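We modelled each protein-ligand pair independently. The example shown here corresponds to the flavin-adenine dinucleotide entry; the chain sequence is given first, followed by the ligand as SMILES.
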Amino acid sequence: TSKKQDEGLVTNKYKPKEPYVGRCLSNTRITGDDAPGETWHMVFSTEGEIPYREGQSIGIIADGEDKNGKPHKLRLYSIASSALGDFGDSKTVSLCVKRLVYTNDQGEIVKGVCSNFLCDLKPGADVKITGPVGKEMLMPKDPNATVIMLATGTGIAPFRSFLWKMFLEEHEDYKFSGLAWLFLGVPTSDSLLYKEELEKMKEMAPDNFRLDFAVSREQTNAAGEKMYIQTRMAEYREELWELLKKDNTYVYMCGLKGMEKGIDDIMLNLAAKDGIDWMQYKKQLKKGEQWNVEVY
Ligand SMILES: Cc1cc2nc3c(=O)[nH]c(=O)nc-3n(C[C@H](O)[C@H](O)[C@H](O)COP(=O)(O)OP(=O)(O)OC[C@H]3O[C@@H](n4cnc5c(N)ncnc54)[C@H](O)[C@@H]3O)c2cc1C
């Protein structure tokens, strides 16, 4: 009754009142020095106790207390590993975490509570985990699906999870034969996430995986406009539009809230040519599980 992989789905095994206590096994900065901020890839032990799947999130409760002396409110992070984890044994989970640092209106530097806690983790440290959480970003059941994945920044996370399942693992009950197409938008080359893994998947499975980067501070269209994800999609617009008409095409979008706006402009321009109102047609595709969005 869903087109997505929800059979036996588990949500909310661990709740904030009694989280699962994992251990940090690894934590590595995956961005270079020429990135506006730092993004970190981290691995936690789970003892096989968190039965998550591709597209789900976990909550993290940062150590310490809020200003009223209460445990910190959980923050959600899209799981960056496949169900088996990076080590193929269902005993780890990985996150892709941007360290939040900003300057407020008074001019003071503010550090995000949970993202700085996570990026500062050392191997051996305890981590309080909740979940798994979510059903919107579950993968399509159809092993022959066209899966279009639209990511900005840490929005790559659930797509790393999908792609590990599709291309880096053997699953008797899921032999991917379709077309996975990832668009990843970041500002600089040093901000690219998982470039090596992705480019290996593309060398590995060229018939089944397409990869486009949109490096906005480095690439421009014919008019000289910055190469965001939508700018890159424009170069394949008619093909993307024809793909969307098909019953086995599924679009997923993940990352920074607001990334959906420029994408909508591309889709509006495609749809209007055919006398279709994209703002109305998008609602239909969402209901049909073919337009699946998780932005934050
Ligand atoms: C479903 C889901 C999936 C997510 N997946 C990921 C992921 O894969 N990777 C990842 O890094 N994050 C992810 N996030 C975001 C994550 O949950 C946190 O919101 C993020 O890490 C920042 O939390 P923090 O505790 O560090 O910052 P906080 O200490 O919570 O500070 C952020 C808060 O500060 C306030 N604020 C005021 N001005 C600003 C400003 N200028 N900029 C920012 N905040 C401001 C706002 O109230 C804001 O909510 C996801 C969120 C959701 C909901």
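The helical segments are 113-119, 157-167, 195-204, 229-234, 237-244, 259-273, 278-287.
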